[PDB]
């Protein structure tokens, strides 16, 4: 199940895009350089949107507590985060960014 995100050219490096899913929590797609990554958009430490946070390199900083995760692995990058984010495969076909609707 692949969800159409947007045209690669529509995402500037260092930006984030929220992607809604049917019957599930939304995802966040991050563009690091020319690479694209995706994780659950919701922080595992609280009800917070990571796409509303700060992407520093390939680490997304949560809007709260100073928490952070690596967007490639979904692993916590800073306290108080301890639970890894689910990661989702991203693929670019003909300039269009697609994200898997199912975790990997
Ligand atoms: S809600 Fe995100 S680190 Fe606490
Ligand atoms: Fe905002
Ligand atoms: S935003």
UniProtKB/Swiss-Prot annotation:
* CDD domains linked to this entry: Rieske_RO_ferredoxin
Biological-process GO terms, alphabetical:
carbazole catabolic process
Q: Which cofactor does it need?
A: [2Fe-2S] cluster
* pH dependence of this protein's activity: Optimum pH is between 7 and 7.5.
Q: List the Pfam families.
A: Rieske (PF00355)
List, for all copies, the residue spans of the domain called Rieske.
3-99
> Can you tell me which residues bind [2Fe-2S] cluster?
43, 45, 62, 65
Gene3D superfamilies recorded = Rieske [2Fe-2S] iron-sulphur domain
User: Which keywords does this chain's UniProt record carry?
Assistant: 2Fe-2S, Dioxygenase, Iron, Iron-sulfur, Metal-binding, NAD, Oxidoreductase, Plasmid
Q: Which GO terms describe its molecular function?
A: 2 iron, 2 sulfur cluster binding; dioxygenase activity; ferredoxin hydrogenase activity; metal ion binding
Tell me, in a sentence or two, what this protein's role is. Part of the multicomponent carbazole 1,9a-dioxygenase (CARDO), that converts carbazole (CAR) into 2-aminobiphenyl-2,3-diol. Acts as a mediator in the electron transfer from CarAd to CarAa.
The record's annotation in PANTHER family points to: 3-PHENYLPROPIONATE_CINNAMIC ACID DIOXYGENASE FERREDOXIN SUBUNIT, FERREDOXIN-RELATED
Subunit structure, interactors included? Monomer. Carbazole 1,9a-dioxygenase complex consists of a terminal oxygenase component CarAa, a ferredoxin reductase component CarAd and a ferredoxin component CarAc.
Record protein name field: Ferredoxin CarAc
Species of provenance: Metapseudomonas resinovorans
User: Gene encoding it?
Assistant: carAc
